[PDB]
Design a protein around this motif. Structure first.
Motif: not given
Ligand code: NQU
Ligand code: NQU
Ligand code: MG
Ligand code: MG
Ligand code: MG
Ligand code: MG
Ligand code: MG
Ligand code: MG
Lengths: 5, 236, 236, 5
Positions: B32, B36, B53, B99-100, B102-103
């Protein structure tokens, strides 16, 4: 469950 | 972000170490951070991202299924009332899973997909988009379930369209996409016939193109073909 | 603490769910919450506590060993310089491991040990104390390594003294304590002869008392006896 | 690695 990759 | 101070190359190095140590949460956090940084990912780097993931969410999905089964059993006639704890804990795991997802979806949307112009990268990311909407669909029960399912379908379909135009029928990304979209049809869209047709046609079109391949490419294509066959055996 | 608002019974219920889901970090967090309610733990509850943290730290130890081996290889003649990343990541995992150990030791010190008066509870907690100091020792390299090793030894020794006075030679806690203290001697204290003597004497004294046991007690005692034999086979 | 419990 079926196979996915 | 906690990885903002770390060099891109160091994040990639550490993701590889984390994989060797089977530290998939760390691996995902490193990747991640790498995404980024804002640069496009190489093939190897895309694989690190997906593996990390896949393993994190895979564990969450397995836990969610255990808890959902306990919860379903609790709601059968003759089951003794045990309070809200089973539902609460299933909801906790579910929320972390969402959450994962959505990440991952967030990384794809900001900005991996839009910068991916080559067929191999774009299809790879669109397959991921379909996959993580599929995981959201697995746990969805509310007003948005239909829209989540459609989001998965749309991502898979765009990926299928590009893959059919731009990649050979033996390409492992094309094959894996088809495998997963077929599972989407069977498990999510209540379309087992479509699932079976897709798996069969994908298998047969790959078989016909194996003659073009080197030994090493043949190995990869045939492995996924066997997964297609395994699903077909399960479903027929 | 994040578990302060949850009922003790609900924490215990959720720890059991987490175990079934193989969610050992959650299991440990639930059990930490349960301990911090301030009441003594039952046997079943002590087992939940130990299983949770054993699994969390066990995973950290395995990761640490992978990373330490890579790091050692990097420091051999002819190894290409790859920067600080391997050391940094090993240190990260190490720090997290030390944190878990410190958390467990903290629970034992505040206030599980001091409130444990029955031999079975006190020995159980003192064995844990020895175990988590042993895990700290595994990664210790500085000015405190000797004191950490001695802390493990002292906890194990107190547990051994109580167990010998108060428990039969087949008691599973007594057996497991001896198994682990024997490993401490072999792996940590550089005392393989002491390790081998302890394992042999423990095995033989248990063998002699098996005749007193029910079928179910016999099963448990013999399982641990086999672990003693397995270590002896490894070491001789 | 040796057995512990
Ligand atoms: C950058 C790139 O081309 N990545 C795709 C490859 C495909 C082959 N592969 C695999 O690990 C296996 O197949 C897939 C994995 C992931 C996807 Cl999206 C598709 C196929 C895993 C299953 C058995 C064949 C090899 C490495 C990454
Ligand atoms: C509350 C209590 O009496 N707990 C101890 C038991 C001992 C038996 N046991 C096990 O799971 C096995 O043995 C031990 C586990 C943990 C310790 Cl500290 C000692 C022994 C596991 C190994 C094979 C035999 C059974 C349940 C908890
Ligand atoms: Mg830079
Ligand atoms: Mg929910
Ligand atoms: Mg079609
Ligand atoms: Mg209360
Ligand atoms: Mg350190
Ligand atoms: Mg002695």
């Amino acid at each position: 469950f079926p196979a996915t990759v | 972000g906690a990885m903002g101070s770390m060099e891109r190359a160091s994040l990639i190095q550490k993701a590889k170490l984390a994989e060797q140590a089977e530290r998939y949460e760390d691996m995902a956090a490193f990747m991640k951070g790498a995404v980024e940084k804002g640069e496009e990912l190489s093939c190897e780097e895309r694989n690190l991202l997906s593996v990390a993931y896949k393993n994190v969410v895979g564990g969450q999905r397995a836990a969610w299924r255990v808890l959902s089964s306990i919860e379903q059993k609790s709601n059968e006639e003759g089951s003794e009332e045990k309070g809200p704890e089973v539902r609460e804990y299933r909801e906790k795991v579910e929320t972390e899973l969402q959450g994962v997802c959505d990440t991952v979806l967030g990384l794809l949307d900001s900005h991996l997909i839009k910068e991916a112009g080559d067929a191999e990268s774009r299809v790879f990311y669109l397959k991921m988009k379909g996959d993580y909407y599929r995981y959201l669909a697995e746990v969805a029960t509310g007003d948005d379930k239909k829209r989540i399912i459609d989001s998965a379908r749309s991502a898979y379909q765009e990926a299928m369209d590009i893959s059919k135009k731009e990649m050979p029928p033996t390409n492992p990304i094309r094959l894996g996409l088809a495998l997963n979209f077929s599972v989407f049809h069977y498990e999510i869209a209540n379309s087992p016939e479509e699932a079976i047709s897709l798996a069969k046609t994908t298998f047969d079109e790959a078989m016909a193109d194996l003659h073009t391949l080197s030994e090493d490419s043949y190995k990869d294509s045939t492995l996924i073909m066997q997964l297609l066959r395994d699903n077909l055996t399960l479903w027929t």
